[PDB]
Write a protein that binds this DNA or RNA. Structure first.
Ligand SMILES: [Zn+2]
Length: 273
DNA sequence: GTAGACTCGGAC
DNA sequence: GTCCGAGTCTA
């Protein structure tokens, strides 16, 4: 899940937990808890607090409690669900927050890559991982000017640049390949090789791509759904991601797949320069 | 500052 | 064996 996915999860999860008081916190896979490092302390400090709100920062969910903030990252396959405490638990449930009303917030993650950090509300923003996060793509803090700034200070590919959460928040593998194709730029291009026109173009497309995505509930390509288990629909609007060997939707040239910045990369050798 | 290797487990 | 909507730790 990237910005669009997490944003949908956020909007649909809030009403299901807002105003509930944590009665217990059960942990079946301690490694997910990053801070405090001792899982017993993590659990003990949550008890008695009420869920006041749910915010997003890049791909992170920020649960606002009374004095604390629970920072959660789903990474590759983490997922939330609110259900009854009387029902058996589905497989791969690693952390459960029990509310005083008998319902509970369950966190599932087949790969166990997800993380959880709990800090006093005022410390959350000045501590990792929210600490070195770049600006929100959909906000003025993210402008062509800002992007140009980081591009020159490096020889690495533009794809590696965009995947860097310190440059811009929330862009992942799918939307990077998709924005580069829309901007007509090869992902392997050195970040510096880009020009002023190419930079403002990329910015334009990043904002539109990410934008259309949230408005469609995200991209379900394998295991993503909102807290209601509903599937997004932006994956029907994908130009390159996951379409290797298939004709480009614009020019008909077969989409190619390579490894760039250590990850699967899709692009149209004809339309992207 | 930056290329790699985990952290893990189920679907082809 | 290969593939994977992520991002911190290495060397
Ligand atoms: Zn094309």
């Amino acid at each position: 899940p990237q910005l669009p996915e997490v944003e949908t999860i956020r909007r649909t999860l809030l009403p299901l937990i807002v105003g509930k008081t944590i009665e217990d916190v059960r942990i079946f896979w301690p490694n997910i808890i990053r801070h405090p490092r001792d899982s017993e302390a993590f659990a003990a400090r949550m008890i008695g607090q009420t869920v006041r709100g749910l915010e997003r920062r890049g791909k992170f969910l920020k649960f606002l409690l009374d004095r604390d903030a629970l920072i959660s990252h789903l990474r590759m396959e983490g997922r939330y669900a609110v259900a009854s405490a009387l029902e058996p638990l589905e497989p791969h449930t690693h952390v459960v927050f029990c509310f005083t009303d008998g319902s509970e917030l369950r966190y599932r993650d087949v790969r166990k890559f997800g993380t959880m950090h709990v800090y006093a509300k005022e410390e959350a923003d000045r501590r990792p991982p929210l600490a070195e996060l770049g600006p929100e793509p959909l906000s003025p803090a993210f402008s062509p000017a800002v992007l140009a700034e980081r591009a020159v200070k490096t020889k690495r590919s533009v794809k590696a640049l965009l995947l860097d959460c310190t440059v811009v928040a929330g862009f992942g593998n799918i939307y990077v390949d998709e924005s580069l194709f829309r901007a007509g730029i090869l992902p392997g291009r050195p970040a510096a090789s880009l020009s002023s026109k190419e930079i403002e173009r990329l910015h334009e497309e990043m904002v539109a791509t990410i934008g259309e995505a949230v408005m469609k509930g995200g991209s379900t390509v394998r295991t993503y759904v909102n807290t209601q288990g509903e599937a997004g629909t932006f994956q029907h609007h994908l130009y390159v991601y996951g379409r290797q060997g298939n004709p480009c939707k614009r020019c008909g040239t077969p989409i190619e797949k390579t490894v760039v910045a250590g990850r699967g990369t899709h692009y149209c050798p004809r339309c992207q320069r």
